[model samples]
Every structure is written in structure tokens, then in C-alpha cells.
Target: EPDMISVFIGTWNMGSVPPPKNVTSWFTSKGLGKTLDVTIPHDIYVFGTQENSVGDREWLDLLRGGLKELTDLDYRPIAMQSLWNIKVAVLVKPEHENRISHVSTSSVKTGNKGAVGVSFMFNGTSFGFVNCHLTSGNEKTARRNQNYLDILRLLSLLNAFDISLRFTHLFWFGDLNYRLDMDIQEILNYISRKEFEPLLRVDQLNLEREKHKVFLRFSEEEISFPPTYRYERGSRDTYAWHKQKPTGVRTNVPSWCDRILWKSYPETHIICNSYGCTDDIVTSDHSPVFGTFEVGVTS
Candidate 1:
């Protein structure tokens, strides 16, 4: 028999800020509990962060506290890894812990940009996750593509295992920092009209993927939400483009820099139930993005 396991992955770029007073909204915001059949306890949860300013111990504590309200069973961290300012952590429900094995972790650093990953076996299925902080900028699409391939190669070298090929299910996510190619005005125009389908055509990440320049064979759910980056520091309704910074004028166009992507081997059964970003977490310049999936675990 094949068991269907619910899994969730979330990413946020904290902009070097400390954890806020309450982080529960990251999990429950936007009616998420009711939206994706996530009212039920998820079997696995993964979180990734970029430009984080807090220590792992305190951050993990905060994460655990926030997650407490979601599931009846205790969710325990399987492993946590970091490189520079990027961090990735995985947690599993108590019932699934004893069934998991062959755990491995690897990290690679590339001048303040890098990735951390963990691979493990659960219910006879191989699973892997790579949390990355790729190159930043509006015109660095090629460089970002190179960074992706490099991180995979480097993580493989460190683990003595090919991270990309060793998993039945793999998730790659974090502040990929891919931006939109249009001007801020045009981007806002489409957003104002709630026209996301046309707007996504100019998204650099989509363009790169269409060109097969990066993230080959990976699948992302339709982005029904707004861009998740370049917001005002503490204003949930404002964008940073209108604000001014001491370093320079801030005209950064809001983009879907933060993302969650997935790939599977052997056409294993995987279904993305929901995909969206949390607007209640205003402590960072980027909103947290999450996706819920139902994965088949063979006995």
C-alpha cells in the first residue's frame, strides 16, 4: 500500500533582522489551514531563510513555538544546516521519525552566496532538500543560473553523493532573488488590476526556466499571489520603491525573489495542494512563501 504524506515548505529572506515577537502568523495566515486541506497535521515541514541575523538555537526555538499550534503531534527537527547567512531546517512528525533513516547533510559557500541541503529516507522513499541564496540583482539571470548548477556540484562534492540524482523527491527553495524585467510602474499597473497571469510573463525566473537556462525539469505551481520581495521594512501594505534609504534612493522593483520549487524521480505521485505567500509577517522585506504537497510513500 502507498501512504499519502502531507509536506510543507516555506522560505523567507529576513534581511538580517531578528525574529519578531510572534511568528505564528507565518503558518496560519491567509486562511492557510482551511485553504489546502492543511487543517490536518502535516507529516513533514521544511523551512529556509536567507540573510538571517539570529543564531540557530534561538531561531529554532521560535520556529518550534510557532509550529506548536498547527499539529497535534510534536514536530521535531531532523537536521539543520547553514552557510554564512543562509539556513535550512527540516522537521518531521513524531509518528514518522522512527521510519526515517540514512540521513545526510551538505553545505557549500560561494562568497556569501551558497546552499545547504539534507537527504534522508522515509517509508522506503528517498527525499532531499536544497536551500539556497543565489546571486542578487536585476540583470544577473545568467549568473544566478550558474550559481544554481555550481551549488549542486559543490554540495555533491562535499557529501560524496550526487545531491540532484540521489533523491526520489527533491525540493529546492529560498531567496533565489530572481527579479522582473519590467519597470516598477508597469509591474504595479498589472498588480493594481489583479492581473497576475500576464504579469508573470515578464518574470525573470519564468523566462529563464522557459529558456531552459536553469531549474530544468523542476515544477512550480501557478503563482496566484503577488510578488514576495522589496517591501517596506515594516509596512505590510507598502513597497520599498517609494521609500528612500541613506545609501541611495530606493527604486527596487518588487519581484518574486523568494520561491519554492520541486522535482521528483520515477514520476512518483506528488500533488501540490496550495501555493501562496504570507502577508502577516512584516518583520522582513520579503514575505514568506509556502507550498503544501501530498506525496506518496511506499511501504
Candidate 2:
């Protein structure tokens, strides 16, 4: 039987505050038990931080140290990529070291937006992970579409060394910054009643893909959780937002700005089984999104 690879992915926009000490708890929490908790879990821990420090080494060390100390995974860094203050990093368990190869990293910048990615061969399978920071602001939706198209257009800039196009499994995560084109009250009502389809119809990214403007290549598991953007920091506002609004949280018509997306080949037969988000840890303006996948790998 082929061994299954337990992959964990997390994305957050740090708001440049740096992470809090309690941030380690998030790596372990199973997200209201909605997450699939394994007996020996999460062999690969992938992280993407938006608006990260330009000087990455100092903070990079912290990421390495935290993973090493907090979990029994004994995770070690494999590759890291940074561009224009956005950062992406990958770490794996010790056992995968011998099999993982051709590890590489690169950055793609265009206009005011860009993405950073790391690629490697795991068990002779090509895998790519990208940390993206797209344009943000009101009335910039068209620009956001153009930027995503630009990234897809210019992905080869990094493929020079990483061969991202050649990857069997490709993951893209970070602050996508796409907003909802609807009323704030409408969003709140749908979010409260857990009516996802109605809300998703007007979601900018969804429409973009529907029209094939951008992100048409990627597929996402259903988002069972609420919109992750513009939440009250340090408050447990996963639901019941109107009852107790988080302090200092500017309610700017909440939307799922942070995202995790990926594509896998039919030959490889990869499946992103389950994923979820938590307002349980509010270290940034954006909530963290997590995914767990079961990948088929050869012996």
C-alpha cells in the first residue's frame, strides 16, 4: 500500500504585528473538532504569512524554532520564499528528508502585487506551494482580477528553477483580498443563517472563475465556515458576531479574503479531504485557514 502524506497548510495576514506567543496553539487545535485529528498527524507543515518582515531571517528562525519546540512532528525547514514583504515557508518531518529533493524557492512580483513560492520533490512527486499577497482596497476588484491573471500569466518567472508548471500537486494560499459585492446586512444575514450558496454567488473570486477571469485552474473544498476577513482581533467571534462584536474590529462588510487553493493531477490521485477556519485565535485582522490532505505516495 502507498503511504499517505499528512499535509497541513495555514495562511494568515499578520497586519505586520508579528505573531503572538499563543499562536503556537493554533498549530495544534483541531478547529472545534471539525478538523481531522490523527493519532500521528501533520507530517508536513506549510505556512504563508502576508505582510511579513522584509528581513526574513529573524522571523524565519522563529517559525523554525516554534515548530521544533511545540509539536512532536520534529518538523524542519525544507524551503522558504519571500517577496516585497510577503513570505512562504515549507517544513517536513525528518523521515521525508531522504525522499524529498530538488528543493527550490522563488518570488514573482508585478505592479503592486506578487507571490512567493517553494517547490520540491517529495517521494519523486513534484509539489509546489505559493504565498500570495494580492492588491487590497475598496473599488480595486478589477485590479485584483488583473493581478491574479498576471500571476497566472507570469508564473513562469519562478518556474525557471522550481518548474512549478510541472508540479503534480500545486497549492496557493494567503491574503487573496477579494471582497463581496453586496450589502453588509445581506452578508451578515446569510452568514448568520449559514446560507453559503447565496453569499458565494456574489463572491468576487467565484464570479471571476465563473467568467474564467482568474483562478480557473484551482479547486477548493467547500467553505463551511464564515467569511474570514476583517474580524475582531483577540475575540472568539466565529459566530454570533452581532451579539458581541470584537473590539476595534472595523466591520467593513466581512468577506472571505484569506484563501487556500490547490490543484492535483489525476495520475497522482491527491485529495484535499477536509479543511476549516477558526475565529478562536485572532492574532491578526484575518482569520487563519487550514487544510489537511491525504496524498498517495509510492514506496
Candidate 3:
């Protein structure tokens, strides 16, 4: 028998004044409402730049209201606030985190200014999730790069612990914030050359040849395309500006910045499906990406 597990990932901008009601409505109408196991509503993580008390309260209210409207019930959304500065959340299946014994990360560093991460165990698999918003601005690029590298180093340490415990199935998902140009041969190359190399050197580690086999570079995959993020070409305005203030305007520029990457799993255990939720455009600057996997289990 095939055990099917469905997971939905979405980034909700609860702080959007006037809100993206269209996006929120579509989430319930097309995203969450379509799942097979509504009883076990898919876990979620809201990664945003806002972290004030008022913002937090609004976020909670927004999600609670949305979930209620969709499922007619209340939900306790989890928050993964690392170092008390960066706000991230890891919404997981009930009792999922308690099942895993060993999980750790350097997400609590005081000066660790731009990163947030979380880890958990589901069934027999070890899963790692991170959401980071690196420093912006042209002059701060190098600093941002180094900060991101540090985050990867911290993640590698956690991964090492999992490897030591013989847990081979690892899933790393996040918005890497690295953009690739036509000069870059592939998306992996973008990170390999600029971001990942420095971190690998610092950690004195290299990704195993087998790592590529399991690397779920969804952006490179063919299921959906036209890229992820969109930017205005001729204008000097930032992408955030267009996203923050939408006045019936649309653009054709797109980039693959946000992603969902995973490691190798048994072929028999791999039954995957991914789709970009078009309806999410109204509620968030980015679309929601989700997947369903069938795992083999023994009774």
C-alpha cells in the first residue's frame, strides 16, 4: 500500500494593509481546500520582514481568521524566532517535532542578524527548514553574502549531526535571495560559485557527488516556469516597490529566487507532485509551492 503525504508551502503577507483578499480567498478555495486530508491541514510557515508586537498580533489574527474561514476552525500557528530578532515560523504536523530526539542549529547567535531556521523529525525522516532575508543595498552586498554563508555553515553543522545519526533524508527549503543572470550556466552554478563555495571552504566540507542526485532544484524542474520573482526592467525601482504597491500593474520579468530543495530518498518512497499556485499572487509577492510524496511504511 502507498502512504500518501501532502505538504503545502505558502508565504502569507498578513501585514499587507487592505490585505490581499483575493490571494487569501484563492488559498482556501484552491490551495488548502483541495487537499485530501483536511483533518490534518498542511503545516505552514509565514516568513516575513515584519516583527513588531502589533504586526505579530495582526499576523495571528489574519491566519486564524483565514484558517477559520477555510476549515471553520482555529489553529495555533508556530513561530521560529531565532535570536529574538529574525521572525520565522515552522508550522508542522501535530506532535511531529516531539518525535525527533536530536535537532540543533546556531539560529540563536546574538549577532546573527539575518537568518532563521528550524528542524524536525517526521515519521522516520529528518527535515530541516530555513527562511532568511539577507541584508540588502549595493554596499551591503558583500556583508549579506558573508552573512548568508555563515547561515549555511550553521545549517551544515546541523546536517552533520543528522548524518552522524544515519538520517539520510534531508529537505532544505527557503528563499536563497541569490539571483542568476544569463551569464550563469545554471541555477545551481549561481549558488555554487558565489554563495555556496565560500561556505563550503569555511566548513572544510564538500557536497558529495551523490548530493546532486537528491538535490530537488525545483526551479530547474519543468513542471512550472517563467521563473519566480518579477522585476521592472527599465525602471530603477525595486521589485519590492512594485509588490508593496500594486495598482492594477503587471510585469513580465521573473527570477527564480524562492525555492524548495530536498535530498535523496528511496525511489519506492518517492511520489512527488509540485505546482505553483497562481491564485497566491494576490495575497503574497511570491507564489505557494507544494508537493505530495508517497512513502512506504511497514506495520
Candidate 4:
């Protein structure tokens, strides 16, 4: 039997905003209990950010300080990559640091939209993590799809994808900016009733997956929270809005722009225990989303 290690991954689009006074909530939270709790410190943690206004040094300080204060563990960054507005950092507990090997990092830039990734081997298993920011805009679905393909090709060219070595588990998490193709009123009605299944049916990312256009075999946990984007800057209750002069109605389609997805190969099993957004943090327009997984690792 392979040893199981708990891992936590999270992503947030800061919208070029700086970190607030207290941002620890984004790292540790009292998650909804089903099996594993987000409050439980994990063996490894990965964070991805889009449009990050927080400088790399400042961000690192915040991470190290917040995690140490909250989780009480000396988590060290093993791999980090930043490309323009996109950033990704991988951290692990002190005990696992020395044993980790075969590390690599890659970054691909596509007209300010890009991806950063890190891959390493641990306990006889290889793992990969990529953080990407796709093109935004409701009608730019095709562009977003193209961006995904480009990132994959570029990363593989740089050998960051580890095509030949084959990662036992691979994960993609970031602000995809995929919107919902539906009437705003109709979408709001479903959100009002907390009926996400019907809304998810019209989600651009899900539709793209149906056509085998993007994220072909990636798996995402069932989302129970409301959309993470288009929220008014300091409130979780009101979605962000742009007023129409004639009708004077607030307009902005709320969507699950921030996402976390994973893929694993045969002989390796991964279990996702908790998947949800950190709604309490109201510093940015988008709430941070996270997923905790128990992955198999051979000693």
C-alpha cells in the first residue's frame, strides 16, 4: 500500500489588488465537514494567483508569516515561478524538503495571459502543478481554449510538462475566466435558490469540455458554493455591477471564474475530500477557491 499524503491547493484572482491587512483566511479555514477539513494543516500546499499586484517578495513574506501563525508549521517554498501577472508557489513541510528531487519550473506568456508550473518527484511518485490565467471576456471562449493549448505545448517544449517521465498526479488550478452563457436574470434565479446544476449546464468551461475542446480528461470536484467572481469589492452579498443608463439596473454576470482541477494516471489514486471557496475574505472581487486531496505516494 502506498503512503497517503494530504495536499491543499488554492487559487485567487487578485484583480491587480494588493494584499489586505489580514489575509490568513485565504490559507487556513474551517471547512465544511464531509471527510477532511480545511482547518487541518496539510503535508503540502500550493498557491496560484492571477493579476497579482502583490510583489513576489511581499507575497512570500505574507505566505510564510500567515501559514506559520495559522498552521504552526515551517513550510518552505520548494518551487516558484512568476510570469508577468501570473504566479505560482509550491511549499512543503520541513521533513519532506530534503527528500524531494528532480524539480523543474516553467512559465509561458501569451500576451499578458500565461501559465506557471512546477514539477517534482517525491516518495517515488512524480507530481505536476500548473497555474494559468486564460483570456477574459464573455465571447472569448475560443481564445481561452487556444490559450490552454498554447500553454501545454510551450510547457512541454520546455520539458516542464514531463511528457516522458509522466507525472503520477497532475493538477491545474487558477482563474480560467470561463463565463456562463445564459440570461443574467435566469442565472440569478438559480443562484437565488442555490441550484447550481442547471447553471453549470450553461457554463462555458463545461460546454467546452463537452465538445472536447479544452481540459479533455481533467476532473473537478462538484461545486456547492456560488460563483466566485464579479462580487462588489468589499461585499460577498452583492455581485459587482455596471449600471445601464436607460434601465439603471446593475449588470454583471457572476461566474465561477476561479477553478481547481486535477488528473491522475493508472496505479495512482487521489481522493478529494473538500472543495469550496473562502467566502469570508472580502478583499478582492473574486473569492479564493480550494480543494484538499489525499494522494498515494510510494516509499
Best model per TM-score = 1
lDDT of 4 by residue, 180-247 (tens): 99878888899889889899998999999889888878898887778888887786888774556776
Candidate 2 runs further than 4 Å off: 32-34, 37-39, 156-164, 236-251
Better of 2 and 3 by TM-score: 2
Against the correct fold, how does model 1 do in TM-score? 0.92
Q: Which 10 residues in a row give candidate 3 its minimum summed lDDT?
A: 201-210
Candidate 4, pairs of clashing residues? none
The global C-alpha lDDT for each of the candidates, from Candidate 1 onward, is: 0.81, 0.74, 0.40, 0.82
lDDT (tens digit, per residue) of candidate 2 on 24-128 = 545653563246443455778888888764367877777777776776556678888778678888888887777888887877786546888887888767788
List the lowest-lDDT window of 10 residues for candidate 4: 29-38
Q: Candidate 4: where are CA atoms >4 Å away? A: 29-38, 156-165, 243-251
Error of 3 at 125 (Å): 3.1
The C-alpha TM-scores of every prediction are 0.92, 0.86, 0.55, 0.91
Judged by lDDT against the true structure, how good is candidate 1?
Answer: 0.81
Question: What order do you get sorting by lDDT, best first?
Answer: 4, 1, 2, 3
Candidate 2 TM-score to native? 0.86
Candidate 3, 81-162: lDDT as tens digits: 4433334554434444344445544352314345566555455554555555444332343454565456655553234553
lDDT of 1 by residue, 224-260 (tens): 8888888877766777765766887656788989888
RMSD of each: 2.4, 4.0, 9.3, 3.1
Which wins on TM-score, candidate 1 or candidate 2?
Answer: 1
**How do all the candidates rank in terms of TM-score, highest first?**
1, 4, 2, 3
